[PDB]
Design an enzyme around this catalytic site. Structure first.
Site, short mmCIF file in Angstrom:
data_model
loop_
_atom_site.label_atom_id
_atom_site.label_comp_id
_atom_site.label_asym_id
_atom_site.label_seq_id
_atom_site.Cartn_x
_atom_site.Cartn_y
_atom_site.Cartn_z
N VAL A 87 0.73 -0.91 -0.09
CA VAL A 87 -0.16 0.18 0.18
C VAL A 87 1.60 1.05 0.06
CG1 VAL A 87 -2.03 1.26 1.19
CG2 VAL A 87 -1.72 -1.13 1.34
N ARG A 191 -14.12 -5.60 10.54
CA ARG A 191 -13.82 -6.25 11.46
C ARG A 191 -11.88 -5.79 12.13
NH1 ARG A 191 -10.95 -11.11 8.11
NH2 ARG A 191 -10.19 -10.66 9.88
#
Lengths: 340, 342
Positions: A87, A191
């Site tokens: 990322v 989550r």
């Protein structure tokens, strides 16, 4: 299998793998006789940390653009190296907007077809409170996946470097609940609700991020750090619904008065032990904040899963009506940045 | 409730609720597929909202009369190993003191179990339907609010552990289908429909015995009433169903065995119900590698037509089951899956 302990004694029938995790930890043998099953559940938790080229192409036929991300984008700064990609954060060379860029090697990917099918789903999910999809690019064997980014940083550098009073917290928590209201209605469980993953814009805007995309899109599913944000049902390896996100938001609000989350002090095994055994962490400083806030916390942080609020019920909480307008966050972004 | 019609054939939707057209957009269901099968799309939308599927204490003590023994289960059994927990109840292994033989124990609540008469009446009926191919009831104790159910223990795990290793060729499959059909002949000869035949309810022994359970307690015993790969098209379109829904499911299970993965595995759940509705059979990955007698066995289980779908008796006589190895041939697979489970 064949594992428990002696009462007033020690464990028998345990692997050397689990007995070493238990010894090198901070979990004292008093805390092991205190609740030996909770020990056994956190160890078991801790240990759980054919598509050929034409098929891939026809699933990618609706997301890929032509163009070179190395010319189209600059300020390439590495930010993450999660298990399902790298990322970067980058700047669009035209238009100046900041972007997130996820780099996926398709040929090496474990379970490519799901990684792709998740992209096809957030491509169809637009909400002002989540980071929306922008573009993808194929470079040889390496899919690039471009995402929104916002100029004002995370909630974390605000949370750790100023002092938020309750009406500014009410604004932020009402934003997140609208996101989880939309998200949970289209059968997604986030989550990972925490402060690193809440992005603030300069206008005051609130957007919610899963750049590792550890988000349940289909029925599926701790080197992800010290997991303070996990609900109690998660860590007993009990199965879990979207109510875990409501718990994880409640841990985020504690972080927003205390400045920091509970159990961030301690290593992930003792910290997992504490989530299992203490239940509600609420006890830190209850006199510094109002009755109308603490009831909001006691519906976020219920232990009975039906007793916890869902995002639509909690959006009609009277603490949320305290909310200052979102532009009130503006100087707090500035105050973090010159500190440097 | 809000109503939806589809403007006859070669036509679109109207009356469509705002809620449904978002979940239909993010289904990856194309606007063309909607026009070809408008009724089938309407039906799986209604099913997907119904989801996968009061009593006085005097009434409960009537039904528990024939099944509850007195005694402390925490004296009668020892070395309790918690295996799992959750919605259906906490599942355990224990060792019998008197017999020295291992047991399973289902600690179920009663005050916080919605529709608790569905489970009490299953235990009453199934208590007396003893078969070598289904796993037999042993005892029960009422401890406060929790009814401990004692069940026969099978050490060879379940079939999912085997199939996630995938080493099953057609000889070993065919024996496992033979045992399932023998259970299904018994169940349907006594007016039970299992409704959830899948590889997590097939329980193996070490010596290779195969046995059926109904975990989660969903099974028709009296005529009334995840991502669900085992479900037949008639159930999923909210049509009416009979004992041949089970025969479809065992067909789905032979594909899961022949490929190592449930069909529709990493695809969207609502779009999965679309494909069962309209196409029905899942497409087999490499039909070159399956012998035609096996393929004819599948075309006989996974018929769209109910009357042409074979019964529990008929498929027992099907020649595909005569390719079956001895049940001892499963023992290396089970032992390797339990070793690779580490």
């Amino acid at each position: 299998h064949v594992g428990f302990d002696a009462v007033t004694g020690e464990f028998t029938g345990m692997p050397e793998q689990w007995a070493r995790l238990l010894q090198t930890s901070n979990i004292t043998k008093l805390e092991q006789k205190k609740n030996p099953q909770a020990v056994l559940d956190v160890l078991k938790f801790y240990d759980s940390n054919k598509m050929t080229d034409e098929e891939i192409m026809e699933k990618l036929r609706t997301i890929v653009s032509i163009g070179d991300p190395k010319k189209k984008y600059t300020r390439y700064e590495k930010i993450g190296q999660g298990a399902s990609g790298t990322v970067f954060t980058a700047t669009d060379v035209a238009l100046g907007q900041e972007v997130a860029i996820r780099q996926i090697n398709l040929q090496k990917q474990p379970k490519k077809e799901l990684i792709i099918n998740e992209i096809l789903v957030m491509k169809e999910l637009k909400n002002p409170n989540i980071v929306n999809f922008l573009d993808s690019y194929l470079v040889g064997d390496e899919l690039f996946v471009v995402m929104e980014y916002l100029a004002g940083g995370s909630l974390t550098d605000v949370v750790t470097e100023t002092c938020m009073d309750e009406a500014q917290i009410a604004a932020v928590c009402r934003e997140c609940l609208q996101a989880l209201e939309f998200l949970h209605a289209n059968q997604v469980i986030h989550r990972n609700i925490k402060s690193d993953n809440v992005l603030l814009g300069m206008e005051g805007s609130v957007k919610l991020t899963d750049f590792g995309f550890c988000a349940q899109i289909t029925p599926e599913q701790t080197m992800v750090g010290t997991p303070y944000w996990m609900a109690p049902e998660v860590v007993t390896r009990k199965a879990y619904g979207p109510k875990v996100d409501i718990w994880s938001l409640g841990i985020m609000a504690i972080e927003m008065v205390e400045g920091e989350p509970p159990y961030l002090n301690e290593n992930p095994l003792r910290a997992l032990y504490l989530i299992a055994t203490n239940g509600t962490p609420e006890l830190q400083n209850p006199e510094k904040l109002s009755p109308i806030f603490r009831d909001f916390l006691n519906r976020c942080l219920e232990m009975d899963v039906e007793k916890r609020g869902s995002a639509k019920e909690l959006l009609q909480h009277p603490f949320l009506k305290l909310a200052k307008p979102l532009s009130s966050l503006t100087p707090l972004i500035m105050a973090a940045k010159e500190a440097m």
